[PDB]
């Protein structure tokens, strides 16, 4: 036996790039550990990256905004949401839904 990890170590500081492509029907949740922001948030929210598979550093960015609009008026809906983020509805779908049953938002 005797095997295992020896000692490793990067010194290079890489960058995160965006691209899009397909993916497996039959696949795994977002892998948080290790995503930037992955602390910003608390479990609740982390639950939502990883069912809806978005990155928990951006569903940061979208809060203010989202709220942002919202605190203006006060009546903010999907048709808007989706837009203030413009990303795929279907995204925000389950992001929208759970600000408006947390009391962040409310739908018009």
Do not use: W
């Not at 990256?49 to 009546?75: I, W």
Request: with cysteine; glycine share 10%; charged share 25%.
């Amino acid at each position: 036996g005797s095997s295992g990890s020896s000692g490793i170590d990067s010194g290079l500081s890489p960058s995160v790039l965006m691209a899009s492509n397909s993916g497996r029907r039959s696949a795994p949740p977002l892998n948080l550990t290790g995503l930037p922001g992955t602390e910003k948030l608390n479990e609740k929210e982390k639950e939502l990256c990883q069912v809806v598979r978005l990155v928990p550093g951006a569903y940061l960015e979208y809060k203010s905004a989202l709220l942002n609009e919202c605190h203006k008026q006060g009546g903010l809906r999907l048709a808007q949401a989706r837009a203030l983020i413009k990303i795929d509805v279907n995204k925000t779908r389950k992001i929208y839904d759970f600000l408006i049953r947390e009391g962040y938002i409310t739908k018009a």
